[PDB]
Ligand binder design. Structure first.
Ligand code: 2QO
Ligand code: 2QO
Lengths: 10, 213, 213, 10
């Protein structure tokens, strides 16, 4: 799940 | 507000062997760029993080297909990948994906070239696709809708201004979205067979988009 | 010319156990009605017979899906078939098609009800879908396009006239076509599994549409 | 093929 969440958090 | 100027900025800010391997390679590569592109879209970053994820997971395939289609309008019978490698009609046909490749050329790439769709129009279309209120799981389907409406209000205006000659230019832009939806589904299916058979290397971010909702 | 009056005439002229059996039954029944509906569409009958066939074979599924979706806007959590039998949320879910059935309710039936889409707007949308220039095999893709353009020129005008309050009403009509394309593909897939497993009776005209191009 | 062709011929 996490790669997308990380990148959106900046 | 929804200024067409910042949408084009989002588009400009992200400009840079075996056909299928290159394709999987370029798709993973562009998924990072898509995130950065998305953030530069007005009011997007101000959505709840969970819905940003849902929208990006719902539209990533169509958003990437739109980008390389418009990128290839200055290419003969083939597409230009983000890695920089060209994939031509014969190479794709010899890879066993000639059918879906042909649909892209006729329904998308050629149609874009022949109406001379600009990067602003491409930008708005990708914004309309990104703001998909039909997406399942959204905490606020109505607000996404509100944003989509403000995208195609700004697009209609830009068209009637920049191309007052063409009164149906706005409708011609929106009526490529059905084909884009259709082509995305078929491309996605091709992507799944690759992963299943697993003989083609698939990097982690692409691998993440292909896994369960 | 492309008068919105005759399009609505085409729509008016054609007004009239196990969920899946009823569905296959009603779909065959409506395919006859679709032909008669098609002929009452301006400039359609004047197309070469071979292209009339290609367009009708390309769009029949989406055209029929649009019709019963609009037909069911005055129905709670279910759809009204042409045979006259209602299929509700539970019956479709117990038939093993709840997923695609839910997509129809939310993406199509509810959206139609909540914007109060009229039979003229429905008519134009079905005409736009019928005049699909992307269809493979067309002898004159450009002329079909010419007809589609004249359909959504007349539709935009009717909207700005009948609903001057709603400036984005025209764009809201066209942006249901992606969902309609998407839902049609999934419904078609469901139809094929039925035929393959062949435990559900499939009458001859429906059987003809499901067989090879 | 034919059911469709027939119906279009009227
Ligand atoms: C052109 C059609 C071939 C094909 C088959 C399966 C998947 C795709 C596909 C490629 C990309 C590449 C991105 C880029 O280089 O910009 C993205 C999404 C896809 O579904 C293409
Ligand atoms: C509502 C979704 C269930 C479903 C599943 C598979 C096929 C269809 C389907 C039904 C019709 C019926 C026509 C009518 O009664 O007006 C037509 C096309 C379809 O794909 C529905």
């Amino acid at each position: 799940h996490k790669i997308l969440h990380r990148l959106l958090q900046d | 507000d929804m200024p067409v100027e910042r949408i084009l900025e989002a588009e400009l800010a992200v400009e840079p062997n075996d056909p299928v391997t290159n394709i999987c390679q370029a798709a993973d590569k562009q998924l990072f760029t898509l995130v950065e592109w998305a953030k530069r879209i007005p009011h997007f970053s101000e959505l709840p993080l969970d819905d940003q994820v849902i929208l990006l997971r719902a539209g990533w395939n169509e958003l990437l297909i739109a980008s390389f289609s418009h990128r290839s309008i200055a290419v003969k019978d083939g597409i230009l990948l983000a890695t920089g490698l060209h994939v031509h009609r014969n190479s794709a046909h010899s890879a066993g994906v000639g059918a879906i490749f042909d649909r892209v050329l006729t329904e998308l790439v050629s149609k874009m070239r022949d109406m001379q769709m600009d990067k602003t129009e491409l930008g708005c279309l990708r914004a309309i696709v990104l703001f998909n209120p039909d997406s399942k799981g959204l905490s606020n389907p109505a607000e996404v809708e509100a944003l989509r409406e403000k995208v195609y209000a700004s697009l209609e205006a830009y068209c009637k201004h920049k191309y007052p000659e063409q009164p149906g230019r706005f409708a011609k832009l929106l009526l490529r979205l059905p084909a884009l939806r259709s082509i995305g589904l078929k491309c996605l299916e091709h992507l799944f067979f690759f992963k299943l058979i697993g003989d083609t290397p698939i990097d982690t971010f692409l691998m993440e988009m292909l896994e369960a909702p």
